[PDB]
Amino acid sequence: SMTEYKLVVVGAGGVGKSALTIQLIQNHFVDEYDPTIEDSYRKQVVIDGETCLLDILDTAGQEEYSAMRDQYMRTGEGFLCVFAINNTKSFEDIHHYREQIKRVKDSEDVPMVLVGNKSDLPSRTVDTKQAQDLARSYGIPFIETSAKTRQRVEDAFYTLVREIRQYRLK
Numbered sequence: 001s002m003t004e005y006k007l008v009v010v011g012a013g014g015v016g017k018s019a020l021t022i023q024l025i026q027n028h029f030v031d032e033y034d035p036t037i038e039d040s041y042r043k044q045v046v047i048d049g050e051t052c053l054l055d056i057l058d059t060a061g062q063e064e065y066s067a068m069r070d071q072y073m074r075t076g077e078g079f080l081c082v083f084a085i086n087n088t089k090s091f092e093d094i095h096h097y098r099e100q101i102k103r104v105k106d107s108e109d110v111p112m113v114l115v116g117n118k119s120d121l122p123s124r125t126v127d128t129k130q131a132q133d134l135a136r137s138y139g140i141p142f143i144e145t146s147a148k149t150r151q152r153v154e155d156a157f158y159t160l161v162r163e164i165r166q167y168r169l170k
């Protein structure tokens with residue numbers, strides 16, 4: 001009695017993809033994690049009464065032209081699209097990652113959660129209302145997280161599981 005969920009964490013370099021993933025799996029915050037390391041992590045959790053096996057790919061390179069990226073986007077069932085709340089460019093990059101994924105899936109039905117990470121940093125450049133508006137325009141949830149303090153880290157990933165589970169019924 002288990003259900004598998006293949007999750008992929010994407011976003012511009014430095015937004016906290018690794019820090020989020022390592023906080024979820026290993027309960028620590030990494031100060032400086034090599035940006036080229038691309039690994040997957042598996043963990044079993046209970047979400048809404050279901051024992052879930054999360055298989056999470058923490059992506060490194062975000063290149064448009066990458067056979068490996070095409071392959072993991074085909075494999076991945078849901079996508080955590082991460083920007084940093086103190087980096088406007090990373091928020092603008094989100095549109096491109098969504099377009100890449102939609103292209104690979106040939107579909108509009110893609111389970112995705114918009115994550116504004118680094119919520120513990122006081123000098124915000126991305127207004128929460130703008131991020132909420134973007135998420136509304138895509139029809140996806142929006143969550144602000146802090147990999148540093150663990151704020152909403154499990155919530156971001158579990159929310160993505162819920163999105164996948166629902167899309168499976170549609």
Ligand SMILES: Nc1nc2c(ncn2[C@@H]2O[C@H](COP(=O)(O)OP(=O)(O)O)[C@@H](O)[C@H]2O)c(=O)[nH]1
Pocket residue numbers: 011012013014015016017018019020030031032033034035117118119120121145146147148149
């Ligand atoms: N203050 C703060 N720093 C963070 C947070 N998440 C990541 N960082 C830092 O931002 C930098 C990049 O994080 P990393 O996880 O390596 O980014 P990635 O390239 O997206 O994997 C590192 O110095 C992290 O310690 C966060 O929620 N808050």
Ligand SMILES: O=S(=O)(Nc1nc2c(O)ccc(Cl)c2s1)c1ccc(O)cc1
Pocket residue numbers: 006007008038039040041055056057068071072073075076077
């Ligand atoms: O496509 S893979 O051969 N394996 C994958 N593993 C996982 C995985 O463990 C979770 C989610 C996804 Cl989408 C994938 S894709 C691969 C993906 C990226 C690599 O750097 C190396 C291998």
Ligand SMILES: [Mg+2]
Pocket residue numbers: 017018019033034035036037058059060
């Ligand atoms: Mg990383």
